[PDB]
Design a protein around this nucleic acid. Sequence first.
DNA 1: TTGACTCTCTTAAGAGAGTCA
DNA 2: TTGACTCTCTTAAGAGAGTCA
Lengths: 162, 162
Amino acid sequence: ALTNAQILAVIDSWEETVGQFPVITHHVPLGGGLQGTLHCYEIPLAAPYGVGFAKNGPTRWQYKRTINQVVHRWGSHTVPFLLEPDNINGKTCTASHLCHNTRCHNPLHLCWESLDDNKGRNWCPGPNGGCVHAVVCLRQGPLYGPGATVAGPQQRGSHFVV
Amino acid sequence: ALTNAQILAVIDSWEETVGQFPVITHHVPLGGGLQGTLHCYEIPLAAPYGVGFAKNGPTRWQYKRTINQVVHRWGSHTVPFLLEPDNINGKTCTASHLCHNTRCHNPLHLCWESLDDNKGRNWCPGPNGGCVHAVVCLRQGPLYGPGATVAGPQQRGSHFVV
DNA sequence: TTGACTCTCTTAAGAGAGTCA
DNA sequence: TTGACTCTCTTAAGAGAGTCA
Ligand code: NA
Ligand code: NA
Ligand SMILES: [Zn+2]
Ligand SMILES: [Zn+2]
Ligand SMILES: [Zn+2]
Ligand SMILES: [Zn+2]
């Protein structure tokens, strides 16, 4: 098994490589009508992506390192969390984009949480709009708002009460 | 079926049948430390379910009627909305449980909206906790709260900024 | 050891359609 | 005509693993 020092070396090489990705400044809603700025380190749209990186899906990548003749591979956003527990409350931990920008690999824009917690950030009002996430959101979720509901609750007869 | 009259007849028959499902009272969080009461009309756990109804999955059902010698079939929660547009902004409209109770078929607990709007209600603070849904939530979403994040954003080196 | 592709799978909110009696 | 089963698919947040040079 890879030692702690070996895993730290993997994290360090990943950080070195991602830190050289193009850094894109994005202005974002924070909630409460306030605007903020995030700096995303974006993996390229097409090969080459960076040392150790390869695309396994339209917006999925993996990081690969060969250590003592054995190939090891991880989801590209999971690397910052290799020294953390990988489940909680019986749920698998997932890399969760606080910046909501899939190509971004900035570890300051990632957290490690259940898929439900991850998804729920899409609708959060944001750090200046009432976010209650213990690990606070960096921005208002892209899907926060009144929604676009086509039809509400309704009945034709009188068979139902709310 | 094609005609408006035929569609209204399908809606009326569905309402009459669902109107005879057992009515189960559920006390629910509203947000803001308040609680409310919902009356769900719950499809049975096992066959028979009711005239026109059959189970296609663990928590999936369909409603079917024979019109002009042809069988017409719909997802069991879609029937109230047969006269509504079936898409919005190029996204499929879905039946969305305001009561977060799959077996419930009370149309006063359903709306018709994109899958993203639908999902997002799981994390809404609720009608007394800040819900901004234009078609208002009936309860706080079951997944609202601080979450259980295992690890937050972090870096080992000095290559990244927020 | 490395790059650039290939494939299928998970989850939990939702769907459509066929086989028998 | 109606009932009771069977199967796979959609979405958008996420995954593991194979092949070739
Ligand atoms: Na996310
Ligand atoms: Na829902
Ligand atoms: Zn980012
Ligand atoms: Zn938040
Ligand atoms: Zn209900
Ligand atoms: Zn709401």
